[PDB]
Design a protein around this nucleic acid. Structure first.
Ligand code: MG
Ligand code: MG
Ligand code: MG
Ligand code: MG
Length: 41
RNA sequence: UGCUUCGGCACAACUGUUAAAAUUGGAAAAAUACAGAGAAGAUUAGCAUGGCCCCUGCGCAAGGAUGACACGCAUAAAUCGAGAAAUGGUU
């Protein structure tokens, strides 16, 4: 079963990791922008 | 200073980016914290390509993580007509 699950994952995956950083990083930046706008308010 | 009919002539001819400043602004770096690496399973050699990306180098070398980046994540609708049927107006 661990072999079959390793197989299933490795047969599905074509991505890389930093795309995950991507959206999260943009959200972080957006949050920072919102905080700055609030400070300006 | 010559020459002087001693009256005067002659010669010589325009420095300074002008600051001992004043601002004035833009800069690399440092720490901090962030976060922290190609290829397809993993681990790994690279050589490229493109340019409003550079750095080191005397460089038409070589290197910088294959220097980096890009590299697609294609929520890139790459999109629509054929026909029967059937229903709607009008006679
Ligand atoms: Mg190369
Ligand atoms: Mg090189
Ligand atoms: Mg190496
Ligand atoms: Mg390169």
């Amino acid at each position: 079963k661990e072999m079959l699950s390793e197989a299933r994952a490795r047969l599905a995956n074509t991505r890389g990791k930093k795309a995950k950083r991507k959206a999260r990083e943009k959200q972080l930046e957006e949050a920072r922008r919102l905080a700055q706008l609030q400070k300006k308010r």
